[PDB]
């Protein structure tokens, strides 16, 4: 399987070295509806006039990015997203900027956030959770092979496509790094202990986060939760986890090796690398090639009533996009 990661790295390296730029403009798109709002702006359903295709457009306010000192991370986000290519990663179709904003135009993933199905249904059965888990396992194998750390795994960042497969989105904290890095970033419930302990960390954080995700999918609640972040960090650091009685012994054993506080012993971080995870008993029944090919039939298929259909997303309050007559932060975002 390592030979296709080879071909993969080569395309990535070309794109990483010479990133595309300015591949569309705002007036090629009609804005329809907000799919989500975030720290620096929002994501909207848009429709491309010439083709009639629907896309999701992430809009970032340059000024807000600068205030929250997130310039570098924003540049990472776009540079990495335009270089990667994988069945479970969202595809960036276009990017451009104007006087006020940065725009990333992706494929529209119509099934909604994993988060919303999760909360509604309550929890996923182990066979259902495993199906999603396998996709993430292959995705992290691809990303880590390119020296990338993802750092923001959570149900709110995973979208379900029309086939019931996962699309990973939000590369805001993705970073290409050989060696360790130090930034405190991510989402509190999913933070690995070494991040909270300001230790200097690596790709092993993503495997911890997979641990948290599988627990949340199968239990319906996260292994560590409280009302305030600080209380959550205490729990994560202690590393004491309890499992629901319904968890299979195999699932409990996988989780104990992913939610390992000592990096020395955490799965995905040992000599056998990701093969320790792929070969664990919980995955005994998993056909990795089948999944990779999307030949496996999803356990769950969102309702979809024609394209442009947004019924699988919450409604948000809409805001018109304002563009200044003066260029803001032009130097800072030159490369975007």
């Amino acid at each position: 399987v390592k030979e296709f990661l080879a071909k993969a790295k080569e395309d990535f390296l070309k794109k990483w070295e010479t990133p595309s730029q300015n591949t569309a403009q705002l007036d090629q798109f009609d804005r329809i509806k907000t799919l989500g709002t975030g720290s620096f702006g929002r994501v909207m359903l848009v429709k491309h006039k010439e083709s009639g295709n629907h896309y999701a457009m992430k809009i970032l306010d340059k000024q807000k990015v600068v205030k929250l000192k997130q310039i570098e991370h924003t540049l990472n986000e776009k540079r990495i997203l335009q270089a990667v290519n994988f069945p479970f990663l969202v595809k960036l179709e276009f990017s451009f900027k104007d006087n006020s904003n940065l725009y990333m135009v992706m494929e529209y993933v119509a099934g909604g956030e994993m988060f919303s199905h999760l909360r509604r249904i309550g929890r996923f059965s182990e066979p259902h959770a495993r199906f999603y888990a396998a996709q993430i396992v292959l995705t992290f194998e691809y990303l880590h092979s390119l020296d990338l750390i993802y750092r923001d795994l959570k149900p709110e960042n995973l979208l379900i496509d029309q086939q019931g497969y996962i699309q990973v989105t939000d590369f805001g904290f993705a970073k290409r790094v050989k060696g360790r890095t130090w930034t405190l970033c991510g989402t509190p419930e999913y933070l690995a202990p070494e991040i909270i302990l300001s230790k200097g960390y690596n790709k092993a954080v993503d495997w911890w986060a997979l641990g948290v995700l599988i627990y949340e999918m199968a239990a319906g609640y996260p292994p560590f939760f409280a009302d305030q972040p600080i209380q959550i960090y205490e729990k994560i650091v202690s590393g004491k986890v309890r499992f629901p009685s319904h968890f299979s012994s195999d699932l409990k054993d996988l989780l104990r090796n992913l939610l390992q506080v000592d990096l020395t012993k955490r799965f995905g971080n040992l000599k056998n690398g990701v093969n320790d995870i792929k070969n664990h008993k919980w995955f005994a029944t998993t056909d990795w090639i089948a999944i990779y090919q999307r030949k496996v039939e999803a356990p769950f298929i969102p309702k979809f009533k024609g394209p442009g259909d947004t019924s699988n997303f919450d409604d948000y309050e809409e805001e018109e996009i304002r563009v200044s007559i003066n260029e803001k932060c032009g130097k800072e975002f030159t490369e975007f």
């Binding site: 805001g172 970033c185 989402t187 509190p188 609640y221 939760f225 409280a226």
Partner: peptide
């Protein structure tokens, strides 16, 4: 139950990232 405790907690909706 743990489920009851979670559902009564303030962090059952969409969770924002932290930038620090």
């Amino acid at each position: 139950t743990t489920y009851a405790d979670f559902i009564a907690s303030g962090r059952t909706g969409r969770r924002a990232s932290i930038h620090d």
